[PDB]
Design an enzyme around this catalytic site. Structure first.
Site, PDB file in Angstrom:
ATOM      1  N   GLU A 169      -4.636  -9.827   0.932  1.00 37.33           N
ATOM      2  CA  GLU A 169      -5.425  -8.866   0.178  1.00 37.33           C
ATOM      3  C   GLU A 169      -4.514  -7.966  -0.644  1.00 37.33           C
ATOM      4  OE1 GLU A 169      -7.601  -6.043   2.531  1.00 37.33           O
ATOM      5  OE2 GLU A 169      -8.715  -5.265   0.812  1.00 37.33           O
TER       6      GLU A 169
ATOM      7  N   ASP B 121       4.510   5.179   7.911  1.00 38.07           N
ATOM      8  CA  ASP B 121       4.438   6.063   6.757  1.00 38.07           C
ATOM      9  C   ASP B 121       4.840   7.468   7.175  1.00 38.07           C
ATOM     10  OD1 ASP B 121       3.575   7.814   4.673  1.00 38.07           O
ATOM     11  OD2 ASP B 121       1.581   7.841   5.594  1.00 38.07           O
TER      12      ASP B 121
ATOM     13  N   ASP C  31       5.524  11.381   5.674  1.00 39.14           N
ATOM     14  CA  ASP C  31       5.232  12.290   4.575  1.00 39.14           C
ATOM     15  C   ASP C  31       6.003  13.587   4.764  1.00 39.14           C
ATOM     16  OD1 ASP C  31       3.375  10.277   4.099  1.00 39.14           O
ATOM     17  OD2 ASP C  31       1.721  11.418   4.979  1.00 39.14           O
TER      18      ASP C  31
HETATM   19  N1  LIG Z   1      -7.133   9.466   0.875  1.00 43.23           N
HETATM   20  C1  LIG Z   1      -6.181   8.377   1.024  1.00 43.23           C
HETATM   21  N2  LIG Z   1      -6.745   7.242   0.647  1.00 43.23           N
HETATM   22  C2  LIG Z   1      -6.038   6.088   0.700  1.00 43.23           C
HETATM   23  N3  LIG Z   1      -4.759   6.096   1.137  1.00 43.23           N
HETATM   24  C3  LIG Z   1      -4.185   7.250   1.521  1.00 43.23           C
HETATM   25  C4  LIG Z   1      -4.879   8.389   1.469  1.00 43.23           C
HETATM   26  N4  LIG Z   1      -4.088   9.379   1.900  1.00 43.23           N
HETATM   27  C5  LIG Z   1      -2.904   8.848   2.219  1.00 43.23           C
HETATM   28  N5  LIG Z   1      -2.959   7.533   1.983  1.00 43.23           N
HETATM   29  C6  LIG Z   1      -1.875   6.819   2.238  1.00 43.23           C
HETATM   30  O1  LIG Z   1      -1.127   7.391   3.418  1.00 43.23           O
HETATM   31  C7  LIG Z   1       0.004   7.858   2.966  1.00 43.23           C
HETATM   32  C8  LIG Z   1       0.198   9.229   3.547  1.00 43.23           C
HETATM   33  O2  LIG Z   1       0.001  10.262   2.613  1.00 43.23           O
HETATM   34  P1  LIG Z   1       1.283  10.610   1.625  1.00 43.23           P
HETATM   35  O3  LIG Z   1       0.818  10.597   0.189  1.00 43.23           O
HETATM   36  O4  LIG Z   1       1.873  11.959   1.959  1.00 43.23           O
HETATM   37  O5  LIG Z   1       2.408   9.413   1.843  1.00 43.23           O
HETATM   38  P2  LIG Z   1       3.706   9.283   0.836  1.00 43.23           P
HETATM   39  O6  LIG Z   1       3.580   8.002   0.044  1.00 43.23           O
HETATM   40  O7  LIG Z   1       4.999   9.312   1.617  1.00 43.23           O
HETATM   41  O8  LIG Z   1       3.603  10.576  -0.179  1.00 43.23           O
HETATM   42  P3  LIG Z   1       4.130  10.578  -1.740  1.00 43.23           P
HETATM   43  O9  LIG Z   1       3.400   9.510  -2.515  1.00 43.23           O
HETATM   44  O10 LIG Z   1       3.819  11.931  -2.326  1.00 43.23           O
HETATM   45  O11 LIG Z   1       5.619  10.318  -1.784  1.00 43.23           O
HETATM   46  C9  LIG Z   1      -0.098   7.840   1.297  1.00 43.23           C
HETATM   47  O12 LIG Z   1       1.235   7.625   0.699  1.00 43.23           O
HETATM   48  C10 LIG Z   1      -0.838   6.892   1.015  1.00 43.23           C
HETATM   49  O13 LIG Z   1      -0.042   5.621   0.929  1.00 43.23           O
HETATM   50 MN   LIG Z   2       2.634   7.487   2.066  1.00 41.49          MN
HETATM   51 MN   LIG Z   3      -1.826  10.479   3.739  1.00 41.14          MN
END
Ligand SMILES: Nc1ncnc2c1ncn2[C@@H]1O[C@H](COP(=O)(O)OP(=O)(O)OP(=O)(O)O)[C@@H](O)[C@H]1O
Ligand SMILES: [Mn+2]
Ligand SMILES: [Mn+2]
Ligand SMILES: [Zn+2]
Lengths: 234, 248, 382, 251
Positions: free
Chosen positions: C42, C107, C109
């Site tokens: 996917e 993941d 953050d």
């Molecule tokens: N509302 C959401 N819907 C779909 N996926 C999400 C959502 N929130 C977070 N994710 C996923 O989970 C991860 C955790 O949130 P976050 O954005 O902080 O991760 P990150 O990629 O390390 O951050 P950044 O992109 O700012 O470097 C996201 O990068 C994203 O990949």
């Molecule tokens: Mn992330």
């Molecule tokens: Mn997130």
């Protein structure tokens, strides 16, 4: 019947007389009811409970350590009796839960009886892999095992055997960070090992009982087993 | 434009005497007699609808083995309209693309695949139910009776006032009813809801048969019947349940 | 950030000539040893205006190139290997189309460190605070390398405020959701949210995972905490540290903190007091439990649980541009993990300038080299 | 002309067509030339016996477990995952149940024309009959929608829930003397009519809260019953009159 403990997941395909069928069913129902009552009245670990259940098993000749008699009679009796009771108890959820509880108690007791030296082969004969670590490895990783060990007091790593198992089989165990891991394989004591064994056996029994419950309508047609199996326990 | 509406009660179909025509009986209000009278409307040109499920990849019909090319919708359309058309003697059909769902027992059917919808007048012969194609996987709707097509397509839910537009008066009577009407296409008739059922005529009959004296043949000797012209279908059963009767 | 008016063109350019299609196919096919494995994967595409489509899939590398150039998806994520082709998910029976396999994804953050940060906040990052991720990576990498023995780990820069880890071992890809949850629980120690002031609690016995994490943290604690942030600068700074310390010594600590002049001697004196502060009156045990709790709470990694719990949870693909910053998800080299710099990560604009002024011609050459080394290790294991 | 299969099959055809399906082709051969039973405790019971009508049991099963052609994955099948959206057959079974409930509410409110009251009663009875015959439409060889796995699963679940109800009411210090998926005779050991009525209400309430969509009800009360076989008995039907008095009709 390589071993006394055994996991019941291979239905027998022999032929037995009707009298033998009835005798096996009644004997196993008596054993299970005795197990239940004895567990209720006493505590599951006291030497009194173990001795009384030993006497019950001897009088019902259902299991015993390996010998000429054990090879043939008690083990086959246990097998066919367990499967007949499977037929009897898969009718209702309450019956299934009761059967599971008492079979778990019986399996735990039989495991406690089993001498340690043989457990290895049983685990090998169970058709799922658990490996025992060596004395040199145990000495080397005693500090790691103690550090990862549960709230078990002290650094004493006694004679309890330690086994090397994939982390997958100890999900509920290693998920809490209460065990040592190395290259994806977990090191566990005996008590947790028996806990894992009984949990997997319970899952297998639940699935088998569900399948037998689905398959009942085909076998309920017989008229000479309806009055016996319908009310075997009730 | 003249249009009339009537409460239909029953419909009759025959696949041999008048194939592709559905007769539909009921009660029609008449203002001249300020009452309700028997009526019959015949609907013609009820076109058979068939759904060809196409194979995702062409396979030889002689053996089912691979050919070497994918299957497109236009490919199956062309294949049908040439070879199946000539084989089963069809001169006119309105093939279309459609998207229909299937969730029933027929093995090996995609849930939400594409289909070729062939709508052609019922006069032409019906294809066999087990027809298999080089390009198309299999056809449904081969033997769906015209009555079912009319009922489903027109969204008619049991006896309900139906209003017909453009009622043509046939030259010769086709039924014993007092009023008759014609409908070229099933789409010319619509369903109207906000109306109450009209009272109908109910006749209760009973007769006495007797085995013939000579050899085992039933013979009717006595008949009796009660009538109720204006019988309510929503109110309470009228009392007395009849106003006339006859015996012989 | 990054100007979206120029995103399409640049993205077009990017998606036309910078995505590693051959290496991407090699990775996501994992040698093509399973039938329809690549076809059943996917893919998720988030297009303009945050409209996102799911259950997207492709036949081969050429088909992926064609569709991806035709649409130029703003953001690309990978999903699980389903029973059938995700593209035809509608044409599958309800309930028969279920996720079957996916790589184990972690993941991290930087927003989760808002409670544990002073210089920057939210997505804002500076070289002083980025060390957190470094340390985190180290710990988690070690935890995956030693405790679990996962060999094929690809570490990628999330792009803006954290990092991602993909574990692609053949056995790992088959773990159920329960096993993934258990792994997350094992690799997680900082429990509790903002509601609880004290977010870390240690048992009497130190788990060897915990002991090794402590040993790793002891190497980097001084540089990260005691100089760049000056967490013990004054009352406004050391009050936060005191908050998670027993009140019985607070006064003394305050006095020492008032009588002390820098972070190092305050560290030494806190160590001494803890070695003299009887945590449990019954025993005479003293330990850095306060000190070690401070260190772990201020440095121990925190993971996004729900992200890894789900088998079908989607994650941003490597070499994918970040819409809200324009940064590209670039593999982080383990051997240079300390020297890695998110700010030096060449932006889509920067790599385009290098281009408009083969991947080896640009600054993606080292990132593509790390990715290709990971793929080569994967193939060697085969 | 008779046969619930025709009407229920046409209901299903309308539902599918309005939902854009490919309904199975009418059988070509055509030419139609036309659970569990608890062993009864035969004997004499001089204490009040009450009947719990297990009507609409199968429709309730379908509603509860979302059994449908679009949900169950036939290839004995397995219960559909609860999180899946409601199927088609449960959808219109639910529609029938809700419209029956609304008609019952309309009946509840007083000050209605007696003719309108009779009309509402007739509509409620028709809805009940259609809901009852839905399953027969589903599982029957001569029917257009014959789905053997679905019928087998529905019957299995019905037997399971019936056995569970039997054991539960036995645990309630009562005893059940007969029942096959459409009725349950319960011996109350009580000589007080009001006590029997409240006990029946309590058992109905507890079974309902155990199974949300199961709508059980009291059909009749026997002051004294001699049971010999299915539809073989001699009873004093307890017809309740006003002021709590009852007549022991000889049946
Ligand atoms: N509302 C959401 N819907 C779909 N996926 C999400 C959502 N929130 C977070 N994710 C996923 O989970 C991860 C955790 O949130 P976050 O954005 O902080 O991760 P990150 O990629 O390390 O951050 P950044 O992109 O700012 O470097 C996201 O990068 C994203 O990949
Ligand atoms: Mn992330
Ligand atoms: Mn997130
Ligand atoms: Zn910073």
């Amino acid at each position: 019947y390589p071993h006394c403990l055994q996991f019941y997941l291979q239905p027998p395909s022999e032929n037995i007389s009707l009298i033998e069928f009835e005798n096996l069913a009644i004997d196993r129902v008596k054993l299970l009811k005795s197990v239940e009552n004895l567990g209720v009245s006493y505590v599951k670990g006291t030497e009194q409970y173990q001795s009384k259940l030993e006497s019950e098993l001897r009088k019902l000749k259902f299991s015993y350590r390996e010998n000429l008699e054990d090879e043939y009679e008690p083990r086959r009796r246990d097998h066919i009796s367990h499967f007949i009771l499977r037929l009897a108890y898969c009718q209702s959820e309450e019956l299934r839960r009761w059967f599971i509880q008492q079979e778990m108690d019986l399996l735990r007791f039989r495991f406690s009886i089993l001498p340690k030296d043989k457990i290895q082969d049983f685990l090998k004969d169970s058709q799922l892999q658990f490996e025992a670590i060596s004395d040199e490895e145990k000495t080397l990783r005693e500090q790691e095992i103690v550090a990862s060990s549960p709230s078990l007091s002290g650094l004493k790593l006694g004679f309890e055997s330690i086994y090397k198992i994939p982390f997958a089989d100890a999900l509920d165990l290693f998920r809490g960070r209460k065990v040592y891991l190395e290259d994806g394989f977990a090191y566990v004591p005996l008590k947790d090992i028996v806990a894992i064994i009984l949990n997997e056996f319970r899952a297998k029994l639940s699935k088998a009982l569900a399948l037998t419950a689905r398959s009942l309508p085909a076998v309920q047609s017989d008229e000479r087993l309806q009055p016996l199996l319908n009310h075997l326990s009730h | 434009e003249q249009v009339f509406h009537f409460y239909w009660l029953d419909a009759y179909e025959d696949q041999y005497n008048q194939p592709g025509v559905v007769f539909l009986f009921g009660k029609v209000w008449i203002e001249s007699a300020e009452t309700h009278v028997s009526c019959c409307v015949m609907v013609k040109n009820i076109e058979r609808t068939l759904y060809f499920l196409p194979r995702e990849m062409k396979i030889d019909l002689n053996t089912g083995k691979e050919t070497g090319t994918p299957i497109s919708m236009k490919d199956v359309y062309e294949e049908f309209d040439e070879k199946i058309a000539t084989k089963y003697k069809i001169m006119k059909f309105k093939s279309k693309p459609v998207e229909k769902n299937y969730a029933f027992e027929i093995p090996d059917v995609p849930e939400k695949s594409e289909y070729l919808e062939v709508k052609y007048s019922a006069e032409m012969p019906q294809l066999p139910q087990d027809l298999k194609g080089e390009t198309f996987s299999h056809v449904f709707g081969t033997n769906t009776s015209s009555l079912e097509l009319f009922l489903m397509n027109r969204k008619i839910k049991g006896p309900c006032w139906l209003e017909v537009k453009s009622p043509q008066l046939l030259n010769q009577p086709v039924s014993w009813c007092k009023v008759e009407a014609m409908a070229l296409k099933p789409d010319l008739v619509n369903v109207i809801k906000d109306v109450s059922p009209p009272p109908l005529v109910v006749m209760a009959f009973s007769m006495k048969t007797m085995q013939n004296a000579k050899n085992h043949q039933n013979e009717i000797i006595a008949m009796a019947a009660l009538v109720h012209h204006s019988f309510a279908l929503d109110k309470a059963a009228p009392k007395p349940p009849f106003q006339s009767h006859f015996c012989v | 950030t990054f100007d979206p008016t120029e995103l399409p063109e640049l993205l077009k350019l990017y998606y036309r000539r910078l995505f590693p299609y051959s290496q991407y196919y090699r990775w996501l096919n994992y040698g093509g040893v399973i039938k329809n494995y690549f076809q059943h994967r996917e893919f998720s595409f988030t297009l303009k205006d945050d409209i996102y489509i799911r259950y997207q899939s492709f036949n081969n590398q050429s088909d992926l190139e064609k569709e991806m150039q035709k649409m130029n998806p703003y953001k690309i994520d990978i999903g699980a290997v389903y029973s059938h082709r995700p593209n035809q998910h509608n044409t599958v029976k309800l309930g028969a189309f279920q996720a079957q396999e996916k790589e184990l994804v972690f993941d991290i953050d930087m927003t989760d460190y808002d409670d544990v940060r002073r210089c920057c906040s939210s997505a804002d990052i500076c070289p002083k605070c980025w060390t957190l991720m470094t340390m985190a990576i180290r710990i988690i990498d070690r935890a995956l390398k030693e405790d679990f023995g996962f060999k094929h780990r690809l570490w990628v820069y999330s792009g803006r405020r954290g990092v991602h880890c993909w574990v692609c071992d053949e056995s790992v890809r088959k773990l159920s959701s329960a096993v993934r949850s258990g792994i997350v629980e094992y690799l997680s120690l900082v429990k509790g949210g903002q509601d609880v002031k004290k977010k870390v609690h240690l048992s009497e016995k130190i788990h060897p995972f915990i002991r090794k994490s402590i040993n790793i943290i002891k190497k980097y604690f001084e540089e990260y905490a005691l100089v760049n942030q000056d967490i013990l600068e004054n009352k406004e700074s050391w009050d936060k540290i005191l908050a998670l310390v027993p009140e019985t010594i607070h006064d003394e600590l305050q006095q020492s903190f008032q009588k002390s002049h820098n972070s190092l001697q305050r560290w030494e004196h806190l160590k001494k007091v803890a070695s003299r502060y009887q945590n449990n009156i019954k025993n005479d045990k003293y330990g850095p439990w306060l000190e070690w709790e401070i260190m772990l709470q201020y440095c121990f990694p925190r993971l996004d649980i729900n992200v890894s719990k789900g088998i079908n949870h989607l994650l941003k693909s490597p070499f994918s541009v970040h819409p809200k910053t324009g940064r590209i998800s670039v593999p982080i080299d383990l051997q240079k993990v300390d020297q890695f710099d998110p700010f030096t990560v060449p932006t889509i604009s920067f790599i385009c300038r290098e281009l408009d002024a083969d991947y080896k011609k640009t600054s993606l050459a080292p990132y593509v080299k790390v990715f290709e080394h990971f793929l080569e290790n994967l193939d060697k294991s085969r | 002309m008779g046969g619930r299969s025709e009407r229920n099959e046409f209901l299903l055809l309308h539902a599918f067509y309005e939902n854009n399906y490919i309904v199975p082709d009418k059988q070509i051969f055509r030419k139609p030339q036309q659970g569990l039973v608890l062993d009864p405790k035969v004997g004499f019971y001089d204490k009040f016996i009450l009947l719990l009508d297990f009507n609409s049991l199968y429709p309730s099963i379908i509603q509860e477990f979302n059994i449908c052609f679009t949900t169950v994955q036939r290839v004995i099948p397995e219960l559909p995952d609860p999180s899946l959206e409601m199927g088609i057959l449960p959808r219109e079974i639910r529609k029938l149940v809700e419209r029956r409930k609304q008609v019952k509410q309309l009946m509840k409110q007083q000050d209605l024309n007696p003719d309108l009251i009779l009309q509402y009663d007739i509509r409620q009875k028709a809805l009940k009959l259609t809901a009852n015959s839905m399953y027969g439409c589903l599982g029957f060889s001569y029917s257009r929608f014959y789905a053997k796995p679905l019928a087998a699963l529905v019957t299995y679940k019905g037997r399971e829930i019936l056995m569970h109800t039997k054991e539960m009411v036995q645990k309630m210090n009562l005893e059940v003397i007969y029942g096959d998926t459409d009725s349950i005779m319960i011996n109350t050991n009580s000589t007080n009519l009001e006590e029997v009525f409240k006990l029946g209400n309590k058992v109905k309430s507890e079974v309902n809260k155990l199974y949300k969509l199961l709508e059980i009800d009291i059909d009749g009360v026997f002051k004294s019953l001699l049971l010999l076989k299915k539809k073989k008995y001699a009873a004093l039907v307890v017809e309740p009159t006003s002021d709590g008095n009852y007549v022991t009709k000889q049946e």
